[PDB]
Scaffold this motif. Structure first.
Motif, PDB file in Angstrom:
ATOM      1  N   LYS A   1      12.578   2.349  12.864  1.00 15.06           N
ATOM      2  CA  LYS A   1      13.068   0.995  12.610  1.00 15.06           C
ATOM      3  C   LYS A   1      11.938  -0.027  12.645  1.00 15.06           C
ATOM      4  O   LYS A   1      11.915  -0.986  11.873  1.00 15.06           O
ATOM      5  CB  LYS A   1      14.150   0.618  13.625  1.00 15.06           C
ATOM      6  N   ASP A   2      11.009   0.195  13.567  1.00 14.97           N
ATOM      7  CA  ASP A   2       9.933  -0.736  13.874  1.00 14.97           C
ATOM      8  C   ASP A   2       9.012  -1.005  12.690  1.00 14.97           C
ATOM      9  O   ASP A   2       8.488  -2.109  12.544  1.00 14.97           O
ATOM     10  CB  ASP A   2       9.115  -0.231  15.065  1.00 14.97           C
ATOM     11  N   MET A   3       8.799   0.008  11.858  1.00 19.45           N
ATOM     12  CA  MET A   3       7.731  -0.027  10.870  1.00 19.45           C
ATOM     13  C   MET A   3       7.802  -1.212   9.906  1.00 19.45           C
ATOM     14  O   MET A   3       8.862  -1.590   9.404  1.00 19.45           O
ATOM     15  CB  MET A   3       7.699   1.283  10.078  1.00 19.45           C
ATOM     16  N   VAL A   4       6.623  -1.779   9.677  1.00 20.83           N
ATOM     17  CA  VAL A   4       6.376  -2.953   8.860  1.00 20.83           C
ATOM     18  C   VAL A   4       6.713  -2.731   7.396  1.00 20.83           C
ATOM     19  O   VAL A   4       6.316  -1.732   6.794  1.00 20.83           O
ATOM     20  CB  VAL A   4       4.915  -3.388   8.952  1.00 20.83           C
TER      21      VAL A   4
ATOM     22  N   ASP B   1      -0.931  -1.212   7.297  1.00 21.99           N
ATOM     23  CA  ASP B   1       0.470  -1.337   6.935  1.00 21.99           C
ATOM     24  C   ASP B   1       0.550  -1.910   5.531  1.00 21.99           C
ATOM     25  O   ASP B   1      -0.200  -2.822   5.197  1.00 21.99           O
ATOM     26  CB  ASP B   1       1.201  -2.265   7.902  1.00 21.99           C
ATOM     27  N   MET B   2       1.465  -1.378   4.717  1.00 24.18           N
ATOM     28  CA  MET B   2       1.639  -1.825   3.331  1.00 24.18           C
ATOM     29  C   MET B   2       0.343  -1.624   2.550  1.00 24.18           C
ATOM     30  O   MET B   2       0.155  -2.188   1.463  1.00 24.18           O
ATOM     31  CB  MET B   2       2.040  -3.305   3.293  1.00 24.18           C
ATOM     32  N   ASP B   3      -0.545  -0.814   3.127  1.00 22.91           N
ATOM     33  CA  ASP B   3      -1.847  -0.519   2.545  1.00 22.91           C
ATOM     34  C   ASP B   3      -2.637  -1.801   2.261  1.00 22.91           C
ATOM     35  O   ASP B   3      -3.314  -1.918   1.234  1.00 22.91           O
ATOM     36  CB  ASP B   3      -1.684   0.311   1.273  1.00 22.91           C
ATOM     37  N   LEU B   4      -2.542  -2.756   3.187  1.00 27.27           N
ATOM     38  CA  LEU B   4      -3.239  -4.033   3.071  1.00 27.27           C
ATOM     39  C   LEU B   4      -4.720  -3.885   3.408  1.00 27.27           C
ATOM     40  O   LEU B   4      -5.202  -2.783   3.688  1.00 27.27           O
ATOM     41  CB  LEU B   4      -2.624  -5.062   4.022  1.00 27.27           C
ATOM     42  N   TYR B   5      -5.440  -5.002   3.349  1.00 32.11           N
ATOM     43  CA  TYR B   5      -6.852  -5.019   3.701  1.00 32.11           C
ATOM     44  C   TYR B   5      -6.872  -5.246   5.194  1.00 32.11           C
ATOM     45  O   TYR B   5      -5.858  -5.575   5.800  1.00 32.11           O
ATOM     46  CB  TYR B   5      -7.600  -6.190   3.069  1.00 32.11           C
ATOM     47  N   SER B   6      -8.039  -5.105   5.788  1.00 34.88           N
ATOM     48  CA  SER B   6      -8.133  -5.310   7.205  1.00 34.88           C
ATOM     49  C   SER B   6      -9.491  -5.889   7.564  1.00 34.88           C
ATOM     50  O   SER B   6     -10.503  -5.556   6.944  1.00 34.88           O
ATOM     51  CB  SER B   6      -7.921  -3.976   7.903  1.00 34.88           C
ATOM     52  N   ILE B   7      -9.502  -6.772   8.556  1.00 30.88           N
ATOM     53  CA  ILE B   7     -10.738  -7.377   9.031  1.00 30.88           C
ATOM     54  C   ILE B   7     -10.828  -7.155  10.543  1.00 30.88           C
ATOM     55  O   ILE B   7      -9.874  -7.418  11.261  1.00 30.88           O
ATOM     56  CB  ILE B   7     -10.783  -8.909   8.721  1.00 30.88           C
TER      57      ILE B   7
ATOM     58  N   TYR C   1      -1.084  -1.836  -4.835  1.00 31.68           N
ATOM     59  CA  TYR C   1      -1.069  -0.902  -3.719  1.00 31.68           C
ATOM     60  C   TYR C   1       0.200  -1.129  -2.895  1.00 31.68           C
ATOM     61  O   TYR C   1       0.891  -0.179  -2.523  1.00 31.68           O
ATOM     62  CB  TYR C   1      -2.298  -1.095  -2.832  1.00 31.68           C
ATOM     63  N   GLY C   2       0.495  -2.397  -2.623  1.00 33.11           N
ATOM     64  CA  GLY C   2       1.682  -2.743  -1.863  1.00 33.11           C
ATOM     65  C   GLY C   2       2.960  -2.233  -2.515  1.00 33.11           C
ATOM     66  O   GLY C   2       3.845  -1.723  -1.835  1.00 33.11           O
TER      67      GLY C   2
END
Ligand SMILES: O=C(O)c1ccnc2c(O)cccc12
Ligand SMILES: [Cl-]
Ligand code: NI
Ligand SMILES: [Zn+2]
Length: 348
Positions: free
Chosen positions: A303-306, A184-190, A292-293
């Motif tokens: 509606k739900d989307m971050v 979401d928001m093209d963030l990083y992920s762990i 990126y964000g």
């Protein structure tokens, strides 16, 4: 570095492992990010929890049944939300004869068996479970408190986004899977696998991501027309052969328990679980993510989307561009190859 943009693996010494943000900067200095995905196995010593012999009573508020529809490499997965159940109830169902893991030799076997039966006997997934398994006293890579600039969201607005700036637990089962998508928001992920059977991954280099979306829009024109970014729905699955057939660069990797997985900004990924397992994840960011964000194409039909307000990040880290940005004239182009600014120290 890493001109092939292949998935890299890192074995950090307990000393390097202490500061999360730093090591992230380090792997980015080694080009790890160009692959979109990177693996990091903790020091032989480190452990996040003492024992997982108490979770059997833990509850899963909303497990989901994964119905997959499609043929010849292209599928759409639908979610049927089930009734709450414990990890015990889940493990029994996951280990039963019906949902059990098939017998195989080489990984390439389970892989072909996966892409052959993913539309049959729809499995259950204990996904989006609010919680963490880390022990409150662990100060290394604690998904609950990574201390990155993403904390700015909660600090300034008090806003909490479950699974993004808070931890999520995923109880896997054989054939459970995650569709192609960027964070979401093209963030990083762990992602950390606490225990259980392996979890395989597929990744597309951020520098080739646009090609993957062009392919996806072509095979799913209806979905594409209904939403500017239908892939964020996490319902689209596309096999490796299908990617090969259309020249989409990608890499594979298998995550076994005790190993970490890191996805980078705009890095498309997908995969499936080998069997019963648990995984913990959350998103995080580095100064590099801000751009990126700002340019993330978000879901426009739900509606739900971050949706995170970039305002506070541009102000604090891009003051000279703030005014131009609020006027819509910031035409900055992103170079998916450049490492994050914080990696300077490891580049001298
Ligand atoms: O289901 C997974 O194990 C999984 C892997 C990687 N990314 C994910 C995500 O971004 C949302 C939900 C699940 C996943
Ligand atoms: Cl369609
Ligand atoms: Ni993901
Ligand atoms: Zn949408």
């Amino acid at each position: 570095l890493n001109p092939s943009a292949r998935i890299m693996t890192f074995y950090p010494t307990m000393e390097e492992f202490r500061n999360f943000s730093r090591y992230i900067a380090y792997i980015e200095s080694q080009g790890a990010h160009r692959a979109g995905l990177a693996k990091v196995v903790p020091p032989k010593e480190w452990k996040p929890r003492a024992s997982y012999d108490d979770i059997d009573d833990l509850v899963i508020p909303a497990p989901i049944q994964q119905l997959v529809t499609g043929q010849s490499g292209l599928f759409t997965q639908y979610n049927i939300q089930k009734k709450a159940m414990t990890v015990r109830e889940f493990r029994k169902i996951a280990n039963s004869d019906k949902y059990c893991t098939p017998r195989y030799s080489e990984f390439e076997e389970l892989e072909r068996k996966y892409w052959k039966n993913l539309t049959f006997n729809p499995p259950i997934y204990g996904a989006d479970v609010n919680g963490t398994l880390y022990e409150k006293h662990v100060d290394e890579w604690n998904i609950g408190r990574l201390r990155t600039i993403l904390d700015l969201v909660e600090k300034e607005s008090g806003i909490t986004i479950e699974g993004v700036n808070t931890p999520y637990l995923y109880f896997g089962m054989w054939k459970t899977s995650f569709a192609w998508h960027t964070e979401d928001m093209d963030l990083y992920s762990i992602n950390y696998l606490h225990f259980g059977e392996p979890k395989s991954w597929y990744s597309v280099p951020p520098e080739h991501g646009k090609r993957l979306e062009r392919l996806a829009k072509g095979f799913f024109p209806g979905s594409a027309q209904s939403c500017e970014a239908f892939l964020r729905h996490k319902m689209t699955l596309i096999s490796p052969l299908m990617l090969k057939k259309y020249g989409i660069p990608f890499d594979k990797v298998t995550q076994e328990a005790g190993e970490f997985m890191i996805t980078f900004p705009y890095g498309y990924h997908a995969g499936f679980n080998h069997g019963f397992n648990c995984a913990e994840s959350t998103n995080f960011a580095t100064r590099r993510w801000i751009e990126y964000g700002k340019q993330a194409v978000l879901c426009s039909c739900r509606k739900d989307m971050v949706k995170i307000s970039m305002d506070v990040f541009v102000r604090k880290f891009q003051p000279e561009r703030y005014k131009l940005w609020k006027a819509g004239k910031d035409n900055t182009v992103i170079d998916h190859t450049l490492p994050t600014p914080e990696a300077a120290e490891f580049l001298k």
